[PDB]
Amino acid sequence: QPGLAALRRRAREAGVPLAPLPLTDSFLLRFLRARDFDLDLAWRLLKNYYKWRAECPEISADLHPRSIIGLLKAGYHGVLRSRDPTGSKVLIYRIAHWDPKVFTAYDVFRVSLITSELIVQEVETQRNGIKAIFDLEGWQFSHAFQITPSVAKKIAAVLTDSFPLKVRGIHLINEPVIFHAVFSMIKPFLTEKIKERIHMHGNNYKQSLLQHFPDILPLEYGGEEFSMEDICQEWTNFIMKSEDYLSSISE
Numbered sequence: 001q002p003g004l005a006a007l008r009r010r011a012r013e014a015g016v017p018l019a020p021l022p023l024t025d026s027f028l029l030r031f032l033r034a035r036d037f038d039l040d041l042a043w044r045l046l047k048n049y050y051k052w053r054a055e056c057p058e059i060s061a062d063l064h065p066r067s068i069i070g071l072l073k074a075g076y077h078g079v080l081r082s083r084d085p086t087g088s089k090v091l092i093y094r095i096a097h098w099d100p101k102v103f104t105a106y107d108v109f110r111v112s113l114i115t116s117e118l119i120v121q122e123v124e125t126q127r128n129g130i131k132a133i134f135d136l137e138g139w140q141f142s143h144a145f146q147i148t149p150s151v152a153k154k155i156a157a158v159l160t161d162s163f164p165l166k167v168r169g170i171h172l173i174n175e176p177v178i179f180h181a182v183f184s185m186i187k188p189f190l191t192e193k194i195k196e197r198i199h200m201h202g203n204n205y206k207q208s209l210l211q212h213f214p215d216i217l218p219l220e221y222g223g224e225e226f227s228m229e230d231i232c233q234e235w236t237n238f239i240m241k242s243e244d245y246l247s248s249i250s251e
């Protein structure tokens with residue numbers, strides 16, 4: 001717990017908001033753990049985290065799950081029960097289950113923020129990071145319409161230095177040709193570190209995906225035990241149960 005007192009001292013004297021977030025030990029330790037207890041880097045991440053929140057009320061003010069319960073019910077998102085071989089939490093997102101006539105890109109971004117605020121409370125996740133699998137099957141121009149240059153920049157920011165989770169891997173599967181232009185909007189804002197941790201698997205993804213996530217994937221992606229629907233429903237239930245933690249850190 002080195003740097004804790006120092007980190008809290010800098011924050012209080014920079015006039016960081018006492019906000020809806022008390023500078024508890026557990027809160028500040030998210031930032032220290034994300035940056036391997038490098039005080040200067042944890043402080044930069046902390047400042048960026050508040051800056052990111054202040055810039056995007058739309059995504060960050062209401063972490064109440066009621067707005068995006070529809071998206072969860074549609075099967076957009078679940079979190080695997082087991083960790084990967086190095087202890088990362090593994091998140092799955094399915095574009096085909098995002099109706100862009102119904103949910104905005106900000107609503108969809110809010111889903112990741114909500115999940116991220118919940119899983120960051122796990123010390124094992126703070127230490128070993130996360131991997132996210134994005135199944136891009138069914139991506140439409142109507143999805144891309146909603147990814148503006150501002151949205152692309154905000155995506156880059158949470159992947160790099162604006163949220164206290166280590167992104168240890170991003171796996172894009174079933175990526176169509178028309179997606180390449182969307183990614184090229186995000187690319188210029190990414191560090192070389194993160195760029196090297198993005199995997200573009202294509203439409204023949206199974207072998208490589210199984211290599212990275214042995215024995216823990218849903219049936220849909222070559223695993224053997226549970227379905228995506230099971231995992232979606234379980235994460236949905238957990239998020240609904242979390243309504244009051246999420247309310248405590250809203251607005």
Ligand SMILES: Cc1c(C)c2c(c(C)c1O)CC[C@@](C)(CCC[C@H](C)CCC[C@H](C)CCCC(C)C)O2
Pocket residue numbers: 105106108109112113116130132134147155158159163165167170182
């Ligand atoms: C803390 C944290 C957040 C908040 C987060 C992600 C990760 C890994 C995090 O650790 C990944 C997903 C993202 C960036 C929200 C993305 C929302 C958009 C609308 C999804 C569809 C459009 C994307 C073009 C699809 C590919 C995105 C990957 C390249 C990350 O939100």
